[PDB]
Ligand binder design. Structure first.
Ligand SMILES: CCCCCCCCCCCCCCCC(=O)O
Lengths: 49, 54
């Protein structure tokens, strides 16, 4: 058959799952340390006092 | 388990205090037994959390 001129140029692309904006949590300033450290600091604080 | 033993020894001192109301270093021993039991508990918490991290 004899095609006509392309009316839509395309190709092979890459599709991935759209990511999320990862809205920071309210209490995210605690993230640098683990929950165990934060809990142990309170225990250490009480003990020292 | 040391905390459990240190807490038991502290409680024994409070009972003994009731009898020997003239020996004031028994109440002091109880206070040190209760403060050292809490410090033992702290170490146990840190040892438990640091041994389950593997
Ligand atoms: C002076 C010693 C204490 C200072 C104040 C530190 C405040 C942090 C304690 C609360 C945080 C507990 C952690 C639970 C939340 C989490 O990180 O998942």
């Amino acid at each position: 058959i004899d095609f006509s001129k392309p009316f839509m140029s395309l190709g092979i692309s890459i599709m991935i799952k759209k990511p999320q904006k990862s809205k920071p949590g309210v209490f995210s300033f605690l993230d640098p340390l683990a929950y165990e450290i934060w809990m142990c600091i309170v225990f250490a604080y009480i003990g020292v006092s | 388990i040391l905390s459990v033993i240190l807490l038991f020894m502290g409680g024994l001192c409070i009972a003994a205090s009731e009898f020997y109301k003239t020996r004031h270093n028994i109440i002091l021993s109880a206070g040190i037994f209760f403060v050292s039991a809490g410090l033992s508990n702290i170490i146990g918490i840190i040892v438990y959390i640091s041994a389950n991290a593997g």
